[PDB]
Amino acid sequence: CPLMVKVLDAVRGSPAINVAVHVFRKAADDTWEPFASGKTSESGELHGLTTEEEFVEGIYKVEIDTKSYWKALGISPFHEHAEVVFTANDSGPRRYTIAALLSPYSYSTTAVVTNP
Amino acid sequence: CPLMVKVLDAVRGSPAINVAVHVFRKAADDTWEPFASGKTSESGELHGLTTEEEFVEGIYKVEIDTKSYWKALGISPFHEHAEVVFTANDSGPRRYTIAALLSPYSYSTTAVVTNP
Amino acid sequence: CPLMVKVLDAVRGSPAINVAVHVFRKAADDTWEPFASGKTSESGELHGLTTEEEFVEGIYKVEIDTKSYWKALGISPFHEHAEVVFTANDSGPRRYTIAALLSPYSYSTTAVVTN
Amino acid sequence: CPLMVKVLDAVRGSPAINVAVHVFRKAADDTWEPFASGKTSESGELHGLTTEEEFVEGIYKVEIDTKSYWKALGISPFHEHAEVVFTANDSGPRRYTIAALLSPYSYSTTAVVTN
Numbered sequence: 101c102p103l104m105v106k107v108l109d110a111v112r113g114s115p116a117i118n119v120a121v122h123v124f125r126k127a128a129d130d131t132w133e134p135f136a137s138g139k140t141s142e143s144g145e146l147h148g149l150t151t152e153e154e155f156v157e158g159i160y161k162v163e164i165d166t167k168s169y170w171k172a173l174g175i176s177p178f179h180e181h182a183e184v185v186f187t188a189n190d191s192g193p194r195r196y197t198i199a200a201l202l203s204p205y206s207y208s209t210t211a212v213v214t215n216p
Numbered sequence: 217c218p219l220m221v222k223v224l225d226a227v228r229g230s231p232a233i234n235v236a237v238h239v240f241r242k243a244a245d246d247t248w249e250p251f252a253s254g255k256t257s258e259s260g261e262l263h264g265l266t267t268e269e270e271f272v273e274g275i276y277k278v279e280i281d282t283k284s285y286w287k288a289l290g291i292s293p294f295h296e297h298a299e300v301v302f303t304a305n306d307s308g309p310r311r312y313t314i315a316a317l318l319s320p321y322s323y324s325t326t327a328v329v330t331n332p
Numbered sequence: 333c334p335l336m337v338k339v340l341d342a343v344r345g346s347p348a349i350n351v352a353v354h355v356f357r358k359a360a361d362d363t364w365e366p367f368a369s370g371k372t373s374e375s376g377e378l379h380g381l382t383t384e385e386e387f388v389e390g391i392y393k394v395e396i397d398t399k400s401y402w403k404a405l406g407i408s409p410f411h412e413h414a415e416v417v418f419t420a421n422d423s424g425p426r427r428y429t430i431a432a433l434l435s436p437y438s439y440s441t442t443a444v445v446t447n
Numbered sequence: 448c449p450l451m452v453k454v455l456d457a458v459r460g461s462p463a464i465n466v467a468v469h470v471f472r473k474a475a476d477d478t479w480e481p482f483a484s485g486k487t488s489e490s491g492e493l494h495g496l497t498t499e500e501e502f503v504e505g506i507y508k509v510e511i512d513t514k515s516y517w518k519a520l521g522i523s524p525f526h527e528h529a530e531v532v533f534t535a536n537d538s539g540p541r542r543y544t545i546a547a548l549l550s551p552y553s554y555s556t557t558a559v560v561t562n
């Protein structure tokens with residue numbers, strides 16, 4: 101439960117289902133290492149990406165594959181993806197929810213950070 | 217469960233707790249009649265505003281008392297409130313989630329509409 | 333011009349053109365009195381709503397007719413309109429830009445208040 | 448000018464001034480090559496990044512240094528930066544404005560693409 105991604109569709113007023121999500125972690129050599137990936141469910145949510153053991157301090161990138169999502173609805177969108185880059189767990193473990201609200205030429209993203 | 221309001225704080229990265237919410241319904245004489253009210257919980261959510269029986273077709277206004285919320289954090293915000301005005305249930309009963317993401321000089325709002 | 337309204341379309345990536353905008357001022361009896369109105373230009377902007385003399389401190393509402401905008405594009409929208417309610421304050425900066433970014437089931441709004 | 452970046456501050460209701468912005472172009476080997484950079488002006492805008500000749504079709508990334516912006520205001524932010532990745536397309540309108548509205552734990556971004 102340390103990392104959860106929630107994606108909403110501003111055109112339809114619905115969860116954004118079947119959205120691919122790739123998570124990377126910056127390595128010591130400054131490259132982005134693949135960390136976890138998955139797809140949003142029918143609720144627009146992606147659970148089970150990581151564990152509290154594996155989710156150590158670091159800089160993480162959550163790539164939400166918005167272009168692929170829109171094309172499949174018949175919309176040719178602006179962005180390639182929405183990327184969310186953040187330092188995690190640097191004051192000890194936290195739980196992160198990364199949310200995104202998608203439109204064809206815009207998105208909004210926020211984080212809800214809680215201390216267990 | 218027909219109407220739920222969720223409020224998030226973009227400054228803190230947290231639910232917006234203890235936010236007053238007033239719901240009105242437009243009457244036949246074109247006035248706004250008080251319909252329901254409540255406060256967001258520690259999760260940022262307000263449940264139990266209405267019932268499927270009472271929540272008939274109509275034009276509804278959800279007033280989120282953002283100014284009061286910000287002042288209590290020591291911030292003098294721009295808006296008096298965030299108002300969300302919509303026609304509900306005009307193709308039969310639906311479930312509505314009204315979400316708002318608040319900043320001192322801005323907000324975003326969306327709806328998730330589902331058919332039970 | 334102390335008040336300008338800017339409206340953007342998040343579906344097409346464009347200004348929102350020919351959107352009706354109505355401004356109201358709260359009266360002493362708590363009713364909303366018509367104050368100014370117009371339609372957004374080809375740039376998505378509505379200028380010339382008021383003057384410095386007329387735009388006194390008080391509570392104002394800007395109503396943006398989003399439903400009609402979407403209907404004309406053939407897209408079913410959620411909201412009847414977008415509403416922005418705020419207090420004008422003499423102690424703050426003097427020019428108010430109310431911006432709105434529209435989608436069918438969501439909108440975002442901000443204020444840019446400058447000198 | 449085919450590309451402009453505009454940055455707004457949702458906490459203060461103002462342009463976001465002196466924000467570093469870096470633009471990259473995706474190379475054939477999938478690396479990001481520096482393309483242009485600058486700092487936002489007192490209006491929150493960054494003009495003059497590129498020319499029509501240089502801004503050929505391809506994938507571009509605009510990185511906005513939000514963390515430094517918030518740190519200078521004393522506010523602890525969530526993101527390292529805001530990122531906007533898009534394809535430039537000759538068949539669409541010719542002028543791209545990338546706008547971002549910043550909060551400490553959230554941002555919104557849009558594109559206004561016009562002729």
Ligand SMILES: *S(=O)(=O)c1ccc(Br)c(-c2nnc(-c3cc(Cl)c(O)c(Cl)c3)o2)c1
Pocket residue numbers: 106108199200201208209210222224313315316317324325326328438553
């Ligand atoms: S809650 O259960 O966590 C919950 C319930 C419903 C919703 Br719709 C949400 C939620 N999470 N994020 C957002 C959101 C993100 C952005 Cl970027 C935005 O602009 C808006 Cl208006 C909402 O809603 C949470």
Ligand SMILES: *S(=O)(=O)c1ccc(Br)c(-c2nnc(-c3cc(Cl)c(O)c(Cl)c3)o2)c1
Pocket residue numbers: 206338340429431432433440441442444453455546547548555556557
């Ligand atoms: S116009 O000259 O282009 C113009 C004038 C004033 C403003 Br404030 C803007 C503008 N550009 N983008 C935005 C904006 C972006 C987002 Cl992501 C957002 O959520 C909102 Cl509410 C506004 O405003 C353009």
